[PDB]
Amino acid sequence: PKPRILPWLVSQLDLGQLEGVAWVNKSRTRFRIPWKHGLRQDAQQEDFGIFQAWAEATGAYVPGRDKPDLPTWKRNFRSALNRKEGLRLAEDRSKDPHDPHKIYEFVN
Amino acid sequence: PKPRILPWLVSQLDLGQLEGVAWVNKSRTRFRIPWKHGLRQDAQQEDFGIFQAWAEATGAYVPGRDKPDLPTWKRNFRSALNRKEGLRLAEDRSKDPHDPHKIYEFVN
Amino acid sequence: TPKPRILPWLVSQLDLGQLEGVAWVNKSRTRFRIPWKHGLRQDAQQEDFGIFQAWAEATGAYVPGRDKPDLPTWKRNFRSALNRKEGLRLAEDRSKDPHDPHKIYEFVNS
Amino acid sequence: TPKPRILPWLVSQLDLGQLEGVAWVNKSRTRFRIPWKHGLRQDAQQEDFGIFQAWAEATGAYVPGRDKPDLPTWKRNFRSALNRKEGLRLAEDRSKDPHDPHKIYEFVNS
DNA sequence: TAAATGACATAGGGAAACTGAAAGGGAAAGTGAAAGTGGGAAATTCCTCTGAATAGA
DNA sequence: ATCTATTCAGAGGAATTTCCCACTTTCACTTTCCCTTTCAGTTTCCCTATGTCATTT
């Protein structure tokens, strides 16, 4: 059937399984996504969990079959979101030293 | 007593029990048909209500017994109307974002 | 007149060899190649979508002059048409190559 | 407004010779000089970082009508782009000269 | 007023990751023209049954 | 010498058969929706690499 990204993303947000990935508003319209830049030493694949989740979810990534590739999972997650109408990028807290991340918000 | 499509269609148009299926002429010579595209995430089953109604009506589709098949219902409905003389597709508003549909018309 | 069927038409283009880059890759004439340069590249230009364009002109999908040029769509339609077609398969994919980007299709059977 | 590609744009600046000490050295144009100096020195301005500034203005990254000129960043962006070009290698690093600071790239190719 | 030794404040710099805009791709869905189909209607053989015309008793 | 016992035309539906007519399905691509990839550059990250000030001999 293949998941559509917005409904899928919203579900992850509601379940709140991944960390650094949740609703940052009680009305539910703004949300955070970890985004530790790739070159940083403290950066593991645990910091690309949503990106990885999406890849596993769409069949792109299958642990065992393909080597894990972090940059691709991220560029893929990002491009999918950009084209999505009714959803804009708010603040770019990506290079932020302690808690690097981004908040997306649904608009009309 | 299998229904003939034009009389049947006109009846649905007059009863107006199907959202989006309605005349657009006081004179009743132009009607509109809901025409959302199958892939669209926003396509709920009822977006093929007339197509489904015709399939159930010709006894081709009995809920419970058959697996829903939305493409064929629309496909059958469109093909059935095409042979009909005195009837012609006037506008194709189906790749339309908000309210997608097609307008047929009766050539005198 | 009749509308051309894609495989016979393609074979004909291959035999005529009018388009540059489009050629049989073997004597048995069963494997052929199609130039497939990526659209965003700098050296890209309309002549790198010649077969795609030819097919569009051929099916009346495009009419130099009256209609407006949609190069990507020409490729999408040509690519999509072959994809369902039975008895033809994708063999190679050198489409992301630098100097000679192209894909290689092979004719098969059942 | 169409975005310029760096090599064709750079070659144009070299031919026009609008900046001081940019024109190629060899007439066949297989080598050229770049106002590559240093930033932690003394009289370093927008004159010694002209190509770097030209590229920044050219890509809209910076416009002498809003963006507050950052000479250090401009040098970083220009350096990275030249590095990735296959048929383009850096000959010598003559930035190691007092009064005459610069750099010599090659228009080689394989 | 000095060659040297230190002391910070950033400017390079090489890789590899990031990115926006737009082209590519998958594959499920759509299409008009063309050809196929089912089921009810019209038509073309089958079946008693009638019954007057023909044999046994 | 009637008195039944049969029997081959013509009836009046059955029993299929062949036709027709609306839709249905194929045919052979085309298009759409939603993301993915490519392009050709930008931007980090993480270290060095120097170029002005400030103490050693």
| Phi-psi sector, B4: left (phi>0), alpha (psi -120 to 50), beta | beta
On whether the A4-107 domain is CATH 1.10.10.10, my answer is: yes
Neighbors of chain C by Cβ distance (3+ pairs < 8 Å)? none
Using CA atoms, how far apart are residues D11 and D7, in angstroms rounded to an integer? Answer: 6
Q: Under a CB-based contact definition with an 8 Å cutoff, are residues B25 and B8 in contact?
A: no
**What is the CA A1 to C1' F34 distance in angstroms?**
13
A88-93 and A101-105 beta bridge pairing: antiparallel
Measure, in angstroms, how far nucleotide F56 C1' is from residue D98 CA: 29
How is the beta sheet containing A88-93 ordered, strand by strand?
A22-23, A30-34, A101-105, A88-93
Chain A residues with CB within 8 Å of chain B CB: 4, 6-7
Mutation for testing the B interface, residue in A4, A10, A84, A87 having most B CBs under 10 Å: A4
Q: How many Å apart are CA B17 and CA B7, to the nearest integer?
A: 16
Q: Which chain B residue has the Cα nearest residue A1?
A: B39
Nucleotide nearest to D48 (CA to C1'): E11
Are the beta carbons of A54 and A45 closer than 8 angstroms? no
Fold of D5-108: Arc Repressor Mutant, subunit A (1.10.10)
d(CA C17, CA C7): 15
Among residues A32, A64, A70, the alpha carbon closest in space to that of A48 is found at A70
Residue of B nearest to A5 (CA): B41
Query: How far apart, in Å, are the Cα atoms of D89 and each of A55, B4, D8, D27, D63?
Result: 38, 77, 16, 18, 29
Q: What is the DSSP string of chain C?
A: -PPPPHHHHHHHHHHHT-STT-EESSTTS-EEEEE---TTSTT--GGGGHHHHHHHHHTTS--TTTS---HHHHHHHHHHHHHH-TTEEEEEEETT-SSS-EEEEEE---
Task: Kindly give, in sequence order, each residue whose CB lies less than 8 Å from that of residue C59, ignoring residues fewer than 6 positions away.
Answer: C3, C4
Q: Are C91 and C24 in contact (CB under 8 A)?
A: no
Nearest residue of B to residue A6, measured between CA atoms = B41
Cα distance from N-terminal residue to C-terminal residue, chain A: 28
Tell me the nt nearest to C43, Cα to C1'.
F39
Locus of tokens 């569009």? C56
SS (H, E, C) chain B: CCCCHHHHHHHHHHHCCCCCCEECCCCCCEEEEECCCCCCCCCCHHHHHHHHHHHHHCCCCCECCECCCHHHHHHHHHHHHHHCCCEEEEEEECCCCCCCEEEEEECC
- Resolution of the entry in angstroms: 3.1
What's the token pair of residue D100? 């005459």
Sequential DSSP letters for A10-79: HHHHHHT-SSS-EESSSSS-EEEEE---TTSTT--GGGGHHHHHHHHHTTS--BTTB---HHHHHHHHHH
Question: Is the alpha carbon torsion for B49, B53, B59, B64 positive or negative?
Answer: positive
**What are the φ and ψ backbone dihedral angles of B101, each rounded to 5 degrees?**
-175, 175
